[PDB]
């Protein structure tokens, strides 16, 4: 099997910068024909993958004239003229010259953007779910940059750790913002014994936190 | 054929 | 384009079948692929047909654990794994690179554990908190196996102000969550509903987010 190596694992670029994909396969890739079978795949998270060039450098039809391949013999680049918001993804460099065709690790691109504070959400638990013995108190913090950010809950005062289940988007591909879910799951005796509860978050946007609260009464 | 744009089938 | 199967538990030791059915166009004139994703790493290529006379080749990899066969009736190919571990729980995709056809995908998961049907709570909001002109709605879906579910908002009317999250495994069951803003004149005037779609347990499940009352 020959080997398919790409460089970098990860690529960080503000919305208008160049960018460069390397590849370099552990044996040539020129067919005795002439011909180079070498392609770029490109693959946003959950959906199928789609191939952007082809045969190196010929463009695959409805694709940008920004997306230029390049490279000849083992060493082969992918070149991005301007970045945008939707080229966040994976991309990988595909060999079908030898038998079996393989592909690259992939290299994730990222956008570098301006910073953005979250806008928090939160929500008592249905009474669908009250009814079948649990509670789970969610919090929706979205649309905000960059990724790091952390998230306290805290009942009645005092900050619980334990229960806590988040979950973080991709880098939206039209405002390359992100967004983050943080659930407290717990049984329905403890949640009727206490009031006040509360989701505070803090990001580099302030050092004062987001606080958004409920009080288990008045709704 | 053409039916692919990687090498064909032997 | 390119219609796939379905997610499917499997248990451990058994076979399955996988069809991939072309529309559009006829799959006489191209060759397809089948490409296999764990979803941790990149894409591993498993073999490829010619639908025209059922010609195939497998990755060494994949010799004796995979067949290919086609329809060219039906317009359809097929990928039958055999002696399925859990090296196979992944994303399998069907594929006629020719002109860059792909399907949807098919996930697999080889496990002994039975399939569960998640169970869907609205999320709507606290005594009206709001935040100017607009209104953040979400859907707790939780209690699953396996992967994975489909969520839309009015049968994918509500295309913006929405956000999806990865589901997060916990206690050998998966969680989602969904979320949509809208402006505060719509809801709760034109009424909201998501739907989750269980496909490893034939699950449809549309809720309703109505404004809360006395509780």
């Known amino acids: 099997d020959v080997v398919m190596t790409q460089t970098p694992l990860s690529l960080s670029v503000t919305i208008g910068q160049p960018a460069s994909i390397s590849c370099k396969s552990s044996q040539s890739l020129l067919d005795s024909d002439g011909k180079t079978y070498l392609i770029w795949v490109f693959q946003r998270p959950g959906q199928s993958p789609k191939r952007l060039i082809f045969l190196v450098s010929k463009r695959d039809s409805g694709v940008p004239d920004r997306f230029t391949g390049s490279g000849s013999g083992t060493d082969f680049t992918l070149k991005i003229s301007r970045v945008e918001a939707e080229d966040v993804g994976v991309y990988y460099c595909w060999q079908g010259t030898h038998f079996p065709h393989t592909v690259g690790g992939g290299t994730k691109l990222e956008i570098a953007r301006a910073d953005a504070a979250p806008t928090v959400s939160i929500f008592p638990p249905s009474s669908e779910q009250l009814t079948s013995g649990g509670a789970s108190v969610v919090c929706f913090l979205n649309n905000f940059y960059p990724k790091d950010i952390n998230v306290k809950w805290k009942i009645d005062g005092s900050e619980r750790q334990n229960g806590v289940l988040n979950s973080w988007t991709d880098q939206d591909s039209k405002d390359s913002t992100y967004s983050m879910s943080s659930t407290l799951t717990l049984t329905k005796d403890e949640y009727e014994r206490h009031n006040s509860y509360t989701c505070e978050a803090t990001h580099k946007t302030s050092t004062s936190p987001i606080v958004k609260s409920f009080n288990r009464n008045e709704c | 054929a053409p039916k692919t744009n990687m090498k064909h089938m032997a | 384009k390119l219609q796939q199967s379905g997610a499917e538990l499997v248990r451990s030791g058994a076979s399955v079948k996988l069809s991939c059915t072309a529309s559009?166009?006829?799959?006489?004139?191209?060759?397809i692929q089948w490409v296999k994703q764990r979803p941790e790493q990149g894409l591993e290529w498993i073999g490829w047909?010619?639908?025209?006379?059922?010609?195939?080749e497998y990755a060494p990899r994949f010799q004796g654990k995979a067949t290919m066969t086609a329809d060219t009736l039906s317009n359809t190919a097929y990928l039958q794994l055999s002696s399925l571990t859990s090296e196979d729980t992944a994303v399998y995709y069907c594929?006629?690179?020719?002109?860059?056809?792909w399907g949807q995908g098919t996930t697999l998961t080889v496990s002994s554990a039975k399939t569960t049907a998640p169970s869907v709570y609205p999320l709507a909001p606290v005594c009206g908190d709001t935040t100017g002109s607009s209104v953040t709605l979400g859907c707790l879906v939780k209690g699953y196996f396996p992967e994975p579910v489909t969520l839309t908002w009015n049968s994918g009317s509500l295309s913006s102000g929405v956000h999806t999250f990865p589901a997060v495994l916990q206690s050998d069951l998966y969680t989602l969550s969904s979320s949509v803003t809208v402006t505060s004149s719509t809801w709760p005037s034109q009424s909201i509903t998501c739907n989750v779609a269980h496909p490893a347990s034939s699950t449809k499940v549309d809720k309703k987010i109505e404004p809360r009352v006395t509780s």
């Open positions: 594929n006629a690179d020719l002109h860059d056809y």
């Open positions: 559009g166009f006829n799959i006489k004139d191209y060759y």
């Open positions: 047909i010619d639908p025209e006379n059922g010609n195939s």
